[PDB]
Amino acid sequence: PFRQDSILIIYPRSQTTLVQFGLNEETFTVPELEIPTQIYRTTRQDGSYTYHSTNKDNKAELIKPIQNGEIIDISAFTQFLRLIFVSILSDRANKNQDAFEAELSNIPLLLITHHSWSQSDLEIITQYVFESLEINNLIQLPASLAATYSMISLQNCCIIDVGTHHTDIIPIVDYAQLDHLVSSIPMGGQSINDSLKKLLPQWDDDQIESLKKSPIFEVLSKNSDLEFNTFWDEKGNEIKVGKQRFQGCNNLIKNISNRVGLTLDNIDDINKAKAVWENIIIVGGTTSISGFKEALLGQLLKDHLIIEPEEEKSKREEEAKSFVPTIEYVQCPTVIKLAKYPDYFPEWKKSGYSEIIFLGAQIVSKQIFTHPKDTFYITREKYNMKGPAALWDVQF
Amino acid sequence: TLNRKCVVIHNGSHRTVAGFSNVELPQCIIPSSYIKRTEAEFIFGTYNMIDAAAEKRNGDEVYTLVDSQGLPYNWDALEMQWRYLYDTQLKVSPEELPLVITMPATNGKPDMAILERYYELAFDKLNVPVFQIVIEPLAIALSMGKSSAFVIDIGASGCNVTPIIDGIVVKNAVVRSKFGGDFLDFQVHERLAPLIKEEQKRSTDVWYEASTWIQQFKSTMLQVSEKDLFELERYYKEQADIYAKQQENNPLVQKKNFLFKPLNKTLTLDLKECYQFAEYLFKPQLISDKFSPEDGLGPLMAKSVKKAGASISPEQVYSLLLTNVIITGSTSLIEGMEQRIIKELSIRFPQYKLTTFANQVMMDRKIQGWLGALTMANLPSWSLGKWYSKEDYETLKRD
Amino acid sequence: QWSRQERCFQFGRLGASLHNQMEKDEQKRIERTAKQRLAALK
Amino acid sequence: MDPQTLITKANKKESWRYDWYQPSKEKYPFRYKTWLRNQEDEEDILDLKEFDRR
């Protein structure tokens, strides 16, 4: 144990699910498999359910198991995992045919979880992985920790994970996710869309979405020099736009910031707190919008930095006209910083770090699965003894 | 160990802590209060309330769940809170798992009436399978490897002093001070009032301020002086005169700076004014002429030990208690507090050697009550605690 | 508790070291690449 | 091949249920759900490449 060919990482999210089977060994590659997170559920007279990849003869209903990051249908969700897992087996079993003795003989699974999943959901998933998929080794890695492990392993930090309809805020102290501080706001990328609809009434949804995803949309805090600029439709249609391309991100940025502030203010050990504020981690699709992260930082500074009020400072400098020492405050944060990205994953640098949580998982899985110690995953041994409850003896 | 997983709930008078027995920290710490927003409607949770509070909307009002006894007094609201916890935080039917909850040490009287209201809530309403009630000072002490201990809990409602001898709680020596965290909030506010402009029904703003800047101020400005402050002052003065006179620095003149966010304004206190707030916990005769020095924490601790010596030698109980002093509670984390509680105890009992114990980890005392219940829930035998079942209720219901 | 807390802190502190080695390896790789690139066409 | 048999041939043994349990000292009066071990007696495929990015 274990073959690197064999490591399987799954990262399921509301819209899609990133998947990878086998680690490259030279450098880590950005996940190439992206499967929409949904399954079809046919209902068979007599009550029971059947699950397929396609609307079978238009008889099945379309189930989207994960919504706003939460599992809303645990059965369709487990069926969806099986569907992924089986597909991978078939694919490899064709290509190579001796696969069941090699690449498919011992498949350890790392499943990236979301803060919102029940213990009940996590146990059921564990049961499913050991009983239905007949897999033997499982790590359930929280998304937040994947984040901090990718980010050159930070003991103290805050994860701001911007989704489409919600943003999660998750403080990490001493490599532990602080559950009672964790929260999400019902606000994300779509907010930008919505802000823009108000500013550009005569546009439609696809036009607005296209602007957001275009080279000329940025958050300010040379394109910025031009009054108007140009970009091209999804359907090739050229669209011109004024100052609106520097708008629409503000309401979201303010909401996130207000939340970050209330959160970090409830970290009880001020020495931990100082560290967290100095390692803000921002992740998610939205964050790839040029200027966004820096704009968000800018706002956290504007709202939360402990520093002398400018008027007060201006008086003191007039007074000294007749050198001014710095006023020291008892509060934190006096320093706010974004955590430093690792620049030595070439493939990741190339594609941006909106999905860096996955790199977290590539690193953890290699660590854990290419070393003897079985301290951080459930094994068959353990499953046989405690069952799904085995899960809680290997939490991080 | 046992094949079970419990829900552990602690309803303090200020904070409520909830989570499962299988992990080291609680899933949630939320306020033991709620906003009633008006068709009525009930808001629970730290961010939900702070958001709603900042909206500053009429008709919004904060109400509490736990009286100053540390006991629930609004049981219709308590159910809504429990529902909220089980639905949105633990996310599990209350019918599945055993429940472990806390009560504060009492003199014994309110006990039966409470137990009944819990039956009604746990059984009639929620359909909980079975529950245990642990006594907070007792569990905290056990969680700390101690069977006998003098447990000094400084929370929001005041100080709660509880001698515990060989696993048993001495009820007549149970003592609850009236001055603690919430009191400190009032004083910080009244004193700073003129620098911040400011100088029930207006519960919403009182609450929001207590939960925001006032909380930060307490954690960063206040300190407890090691020795009676009036004496410290006379001394520091008497010394300062000599340094001055001698040639031809008084520590109380150090300044401390707090950025007050709502007005982007610096508030500066000298160290004395920082020491002053907690002095009230020890010498409450310094606010009103209506408080005797005996309502102060020092006399109170002493009173409770002496009432322990009356069991049912004294200079033995005294010796037991004083070699197992436990200091606990959110407010006990204010810098200088342990040392003053110790100095205050040591001088009322000079013949004896005090040894005190305290969780030094910031988080863990704020929720040490819940931590205590947690370590009860992980006890290896079902016989280690009284576990009330639907039965017990049935049988009490008879005549 | 103390054990879990330690094994956790220990895993974290090792990944830092893993990162450092990943970084050193990359640097060697990139250096060998640039070295050939800068003294040869195309 | 048959998905179920693919699952069966890879990765080469008990089963648990989540059910009512009633502890004993004989038996305590109460129940609670837990993960109990069972006694002796107790669809499709998708094509990657569509989902591969290109």
* Secondary structure in 3-state letters for B103-148: ECCCCCCCHHHHHHHHHHHHHHHCCCCEEEEEEHHHHHHHCCCCCC
Q: What is the C-alpha to C-alpha distance for residues A379 and A365, in angstroms, rounded to an integer?
A: 14
Q: Which of A328, A268, A306 is nearest to B256 (CA)?
A: A328
Whether residue D32 and residue B4 make contact (CB cut-off 8 A), yes or no, is: yes
The residue whose two tokens read 């909307």 is B57
**Using CA atoms in the order B5, B11, B12, B16, what is the torsion angle rounded to 10 degrees?**
80
Give me the torsion for CA of B344, B345, B347, B352, rounded to 10°. Answer: -160
d(CA B105, CA B71): 10
Backbone angles phi, psi at B116, to 5 degrees: -65, -40
Contact list, D12 vs chain A (CB under 8 Å): 105
Exposed / middle / buried, residue A18 (Cβ in 10 Å: 0-12, 13-18, 19+) = buried
Instruction: Give the resolution in Å.
Output: 20.0
- Fold of the CATH domain B1-136+369-399: Nucleotidyltransferase; domain 5 (3.30.420)
| Superfamily per CATH, domain B179-292 | ATPase, substrate binding domain, subdomain 4 (3.90.640.10)
Q: How far is CA A378 from CA A126, A127, A195, A384, D16, in A?
A: 9, 11, 46, 10, 15
Please provide the DSSP assignment of A243-258 as one string. Answer: GGGG-SSHHHHHHHHH
CA distance A216 to A210: 10
Provide the residue type at A84 as one letter. Answer: I
Flag whether residue C16 sits within 8 Å of chain A, measured between CB atoms.
Answer: yes
Are A246 and A219 spatial neighbours (Cβ–Cβ below 8 Å)?
yes
AA letter at B103: M
Domains of chain B, by residue range, sit at 1-136+369-399, 137-178+293-368, 179-292
Q: Nearest Cβ partner of B257 from A121, A178, A328?
A: A328
C-alpha B265/C-alpha D20 separation (Å) is 60
The residue written with tokens 């591969």 in the block is D52
Kind plus residue range of the DSSP H or E element containing A93:
helix A74-96
Return d(Cα A249, Cα A194) in angstroms, integer: 10
User: Which region, left, alpha or beta, applies to residue A289 given φ > 0 means left and ψ of -120 to 50 means alpha?
Assistant: beta
CA-to-CA dists, residue B144 to A205, B353, B366, B368, angstroms: 61, 20, 15, 10
Tokens found for residue B6:
């419990």
Reported as half-sphere exposure (CB side, CA atoms, 13 A), residue B123 has a value of 18
* Residue B345 structure tokens: 């105890």
Interatomic CA distance for residues A340 and B248, integer angstroms: 57
Chains with 3+ CB–CB pairs under 8 A to B are: A, C, D
Phi, psi (rounded to 5 degrees) for B151: -95, 115
Q: Give, for B348, the enclosing helix (H) or strand (E).
A: helix B337-348
> Quick one: tokens of A255?
């909401």
B113 backbone dihedrals φ, ψ, rounded to 5°: -60, -40
Asked if residue A39 lies in contact with residue A51, where contact means CB atoms within 8 angstroms, the answer is: yes
Task: Report d(CA A86, CA A65) in Å as an integer.
Answer: 18
Q: Nearest to residue D10, comparing CAs of A371, A7, A136, A8?
A: A136
Task: Report the alpha-carbon angle A172-A175-A179, nearest 5.
Answer: 45
What region, left, alpha or beta, does residue B127 occupy, with left being phi > 0 and alpha being psi -120 to 50 degrees? left
Q: Does A115 touch chain B (CB under 8 A)?
A: no
* Distance of alpha carbon A332 from alpha carbon A266, whole angstroms: 12
Q: In chain A, what residues touch D48 (CB-CB under 8 Å)?
A: 33, 87-88, 91
Distance from CA of A319 to the nearest CA of B (A): 17
Residue-by-residue DSSP string for B171-217: GGG-EE-S-SHHHHHHHHHHHHGGGSS----SHHHHHHHHHTHHHHH
Compute CA distances B143 → A393, B39, B140, B199, B364, whole Å. Answer: 20, 45, 5, 45, 11
- Say if strands B325-328 and B356-357 run parallel, antiparallel, or are unpaired: parallel
Helix (H, G, I), strand (E, B) or coil at A203: coil
Q: Which residue of D has its CA nearest to B130?
A: D30
Residue with tokens 């706003």: A68
Query: Quick one: A2 exposed, middle or buried, by C-beta within 10 A (0-12, 13-18, 19+)?
Result: middle
> Measured between CB atoms, which of A53, A88, A104 is closest to D44?
A53
The residues, ordered by sequence, that sit 6+ positions from B367 with a Cβ below 8 Å of its Cβ are: B10, B15, B17, B25, B26, B29
Chain D contacts of A107, Cβ < 8 Å?
Answer: 10-11
Query: DSSP states of B17-76 as a string?
Result: EEEETTSSS-SEEEESEEEE-----EE-SHHHHHHHHHTT-TT-EEEESB-TTS-B--HH
Tokens of residue A246, six digits: 């520097």
Query: What residues are paired with B63 via a beta bridge?
Result: B34
Which residue, among A198, A176, A8, has the nearest Cα to A89 in the 3D structure?
Answer: A8
Distance from CA of D12 to the nearest CA of B (A): 29
- The rounded distance, in Å, linking the Cα atoms of A62 and A49 is 12
Peptide bond into B312 cis (omega under 30): yes
CATH superfamily of B137-178+293-368: ATPase, nucleotide binding domain (3.30.420.40)
Architecture per CATH, domain A1-142+341-395, reads as: 2-Layer Sandwich (3.30)
Selecting from D1, D8, D46 the residue whose C-beta is nearest the C-beta of A87 gives D46
Task: Give, in degrees to the nearest 5, the angle at Cα B113 between B156 and B151.
Answer: 40
Q: Which of A5, A351, B330, A28 is nearest to D53 (CA)?
A: A351
- Asked if the peptide bond before residue C42 counts as cis, ω within 30 degrees of 0, the response is yes
Q: CA torsion sign, B304 to B307 to B309 to B312?
A: negative
Distance CA B138, CA B168 (A): 8
Q: Do chains C and D touch (3 or more CB pairs under 8 A)?
A: no
Residues B34, B36: Cα–Cα separation, whole Å: 6
Distance from CA of residue B100 to its chain's centroid? 19
Q: Is B24 on the interface with C (CB under 8 A)?
A: yes
Tally the residues of chain D: 54
Residue B324 carries which side chain, given as an amino acid letter?
N
- CATH topology of B1-136+369-399 equal to that of B137-178+293-368? yes
CB B189 within 8 A of CB B198: yes
Give start and end residues of each alpha helix (H) in A213-335.
Answer: 250-264, 270-276, 292-304, 310-319
Across chain D, which distance is largest between two alpha carbons, in Å? 66
What tokens does B275 get?
Answer: 């020491």
Q: How many CB atoms lie within 10 A of CB A254?
A: 15
With 0-12 / 13-18 / 19 or more C-beta atoms within 10 angstroms meaning exposed / middle / buried, residue B161 is buried
- Among residues B54, B75, B50, the alpha carbon closest in space to that of B65 is found at B75
Inter-residue contact B9 to B20 (CB < 8 Å): no
Residue closest to A2 by CA, chosen among A121, A90, A133, A102: A102
Closest CA to B122 of B379, B374, B386, B393: B393
Distance CA(B140)–CA(B375), nearest Å, equals 9
Neighbours of chain D (3+ CB pairs under 8 A): A, B
Residues in chain A: 396
Cβ atoms B311, B169 nearer than 8 A? no
A143-188+250-340, which class in CATH? alpha beta
Q: Hey, which residues does B244 pair with through a beta bridge?
A: none
- Angle, helices A250-264 vs B46-54, to 10°: value is 120
Q: What does the block give as tokens for B182? A: 């919430």
**Residue B115: beta bridge partners?**
none
- Quick check: C26 contacting A, CB < 8 Å? yes
